[PDB]
Amino acid sequence: AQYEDGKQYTTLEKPVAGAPQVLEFFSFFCPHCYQFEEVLHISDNVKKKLPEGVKMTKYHVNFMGGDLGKDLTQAWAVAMALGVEDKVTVPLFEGVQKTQTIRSASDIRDVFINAGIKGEEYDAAWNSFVVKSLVAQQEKAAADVQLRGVPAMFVNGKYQLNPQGMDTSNMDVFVQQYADTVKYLSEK
Numbered sequence: 001a002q003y004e005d006g007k008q009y010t011t012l013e014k015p016v017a018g019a020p021q022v023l024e025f026f027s028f029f030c031p032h033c034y035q036f037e038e039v040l041h042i043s044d045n046v047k048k049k050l051p052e053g054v055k056m057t058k059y060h061v062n063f064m065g066g067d068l069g070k071d072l073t074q075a076w077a078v079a080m081a082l083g084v085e086d087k088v089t090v091p092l093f094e095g096v097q098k099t100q101t102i103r104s105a106s107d108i109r110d111v112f113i114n115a116g117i118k119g120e121e122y123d124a125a126w127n128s129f130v131v132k133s134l135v136a137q138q139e140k141a142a143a144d145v146q147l148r149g150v151p152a153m154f155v156n157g158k159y160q161l162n163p164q165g166m167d168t169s170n171m172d173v174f175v176q177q178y179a180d181t182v183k184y185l186s187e188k
């Protein structure tokens with residue numbers, strides 16, 4: 001077939017019921033995640049190929065970067081709670097990987113302040129149980145799929161994208177193949 005289990009995607013041996021339709025995992029410490037966001041814009045190109053108002057979810061992971069990696073999962077929970085993902089994603093990537101100016105939870109906070117989130121509002125969210133619950137959702141979802149690597153994408157809790165078997169000589173063709181595969185998987 002043109003799409004083959006084991007090739008463009010793997011199929012979850014233990015499928016995860018009641019999982020989000022399109023679920024991506026990333027870390028601000030992961031270089032390929034950096035590219036998926038700023039160079040390839042995977043998420044928006046997947047979104048443009050899927051039906052209206054499909055639910056796309058994106059979660060940070062703890063298993064890279066030690067203490068600060070776990071701080072970033074809580075900060076991503078803040079970003080989700082406030083709906084400011086689009087304003088902090090690039091400066092967080094650049095602060096961790098480009099300028100290496102993010103060394104502490106305070107440095108993470110400066111990124112939200114600079115992006116226009118009020119200091120009071122960031123701190124209330126950071127300390128909120130709504131955010132603690134978002135942190136728990138992120139960890140649980142990663143545990144449900146025994147995640148050990150990013151970037152990762154899962155469709156309908158049953159199929160995992162496998163980009164390692166895709167031609168990467170042309171960025172635009174790669175993105176299109178990634179997005180068309182997700183669409184194919186969502187339609188199964």
Ligand SMILES: O=C(O)c1sc(Cc2ccccc2)nc1-c1ccccc1
Pocket residue numbers: 032035036040150151163164167168169170171174
């Ligand atoms: O496997 C690889 O080498 C590449 S390349 C890439 C972005 C890109 C595409 C085309 C040209 C330049 C960059 N992402 C990955 C990747 C690696 C491991 C897990 C998930 C994705």
